[PDB]
């Protein structure tokens, strides 16, 4: 039972970490969606205009209504991963959000 | 992967804007809260001074 009990606490930590990186997450998603389209035009061999972005932080997510395909399915895969994989994703997210505090912790250590 | 990396260099400017907007928004929210406090402080001090004047006039009478 202790293994399963520990798994419950792992999920609690993951939840906290996700809240600690929330703002960063939103900013990233706006830019990921923009990048999706940007690369399409680059791969075509054409120019990246403002119209590319017009086809599409928190506010901009709501305003944009061009629901993209690949990115949504990717999110489902992520949600449907094991707790271990998801906990490690949470840790990376935290480090990549607050990178300054890392540089500092290590200089002092 | 070259494509992705090339794109990020172009969309850097947008990134800066997103960040700076977020910073300015939080600045405003905090500034609002501080001004609210200063209004309350000043309101409270007017009620203190009002009572003191009423009692000054009471002593006068």
Curated annotation (Swiss-Prot), chain B:
Location(s), subcellular: Endoplasmic reticulum membrane; Endoplasmic reticulum-Golgi intermediate compartment membrane; Cell membrane; Cell projection, Lamellipodium membrane
Coiled-coil annotated residue ranges, if any: 30-59
Annotated tissue distribution: Expressed in numerous tissues. In normal brain, expressed exclusively in neurons, not in astrocytes. In Alzheimer disease brains, expressed in about half of the activated astrocytes located around classical senile plaques. In Parkinson disease substantia nigra, not detected in melanin-containing neurons nor in activated astrocytes. Expressed in erythrocytes (at protein level). Expressed in myoblasts (at protein level).
Subunit structure: Homotrimer; the homotrimer forms a propeller-shaped Piezo channel with a cation-ion conducting pore. Heterotrimeric interaction may occur between PIEZO1 and PIEZO2. Interacts with PKD2. Interacts with STOML3. Interacts with TMC1, TMC2, PCDH15 and CIB2; the interaction may be part of the MET complex. Interacts with MDFIC (via C-terminus); the interaction prolongs Piezo channel inactivation. Interacts with MDFI (via C-terminus); the interaction prolongs Piezo channel inactivation.
Family: Belongs to the PIEZO (TC 1.A.75) family.
Free-text function comment from the UniProt entry: Pore-forming subunit of the mechanosensitive non-specific cation Piezo channel required for rapidly adapting mechanically activated (MA) currents and has a key role in sensing touch and tactile pain. Piezo channels are homotrimeric three-blade propeller-shaped structures that utilize a cap-motion and plug-and-latch mechanism to gate their ion-conducting pathways. Generates currents characterized by a linear current-voltage relationship that are sensitive to ruthenium red and gadolinium. Conductance to monovalent alkali ions is highest for K(+), intermediate for Na(+) and lowest for Li(+).
More details: Piezo comes from the Greek 'piesi' meaning pressure.
Disease: Dehydrated hereditary stomatocytosis 1 with or without pseudohyperkalemia and/or perinatal edema: An autosomal dominant hemolytic anemia characterized by primary erythrocyte dehydration. DHS erythrocytes exhibit decreased total cation and potassium content that are not accompanied by a proportional net gain of sodium and water. DHS patients typically exhibit mild to moderate compensated hemolytic anemia, with an increased erythrocyte mean corpuscular hemoglobin concentration and a decreased osmotic fragility, both of which reflect cellular dehydration. Lymphatic malformation 6: A form of primary lymphedema, a disease characterized by swelling of body parts due to developmental anomalies and functional defects of the lymphatic system. Patients with lymphedema may suffer from recurrent local infections. LMPHM6 is an autosomal recessive, severe form manifesting as generalized lymphatic dysplasia.
Name assigned to this protein: Piezo-type mechanosensitive ion channel component 1
């Amino acid at each position: 039972f202790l293994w399963m009990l520990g798994q419950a606490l792992v999920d609690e930590l993951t939840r906290w970490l996700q809240e600690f990186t929330r703002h960063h997450g939103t900013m990233s998603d706006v830019l990921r969606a923009e990048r999706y389209l940007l690369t399409q035009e680059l791969l075509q061999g054409g120019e990246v205009h403002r119209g590319v972005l017009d086809q599409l932080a928190s506010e901009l997510l709501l305003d944009r209504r061009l629901r993209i395909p690949e990115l949504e399915e990717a999110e489902l895969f992520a949600e449907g991963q094991g707790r271990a994989l998801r906990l490690l994703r949470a840790v990376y997210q935290c480090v990549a959000a607050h990178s300054e505090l890392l540089c500092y912790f290590i200089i002092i250590l | 992967v070259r494509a992705d990396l090339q794109a990020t260099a172009l969309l850097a400017s947008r990134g800066f804007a997103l960040y700076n907007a977020a910073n300015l928004k939080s600045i405003d929210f905090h500034r609002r809260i501080e001004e609210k406090s200063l209004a309350q402080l000043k309101r409270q001090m007017e009620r203190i001074r009002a009572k003191q004047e009423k009692h000054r006039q009471g002593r006068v009478d």
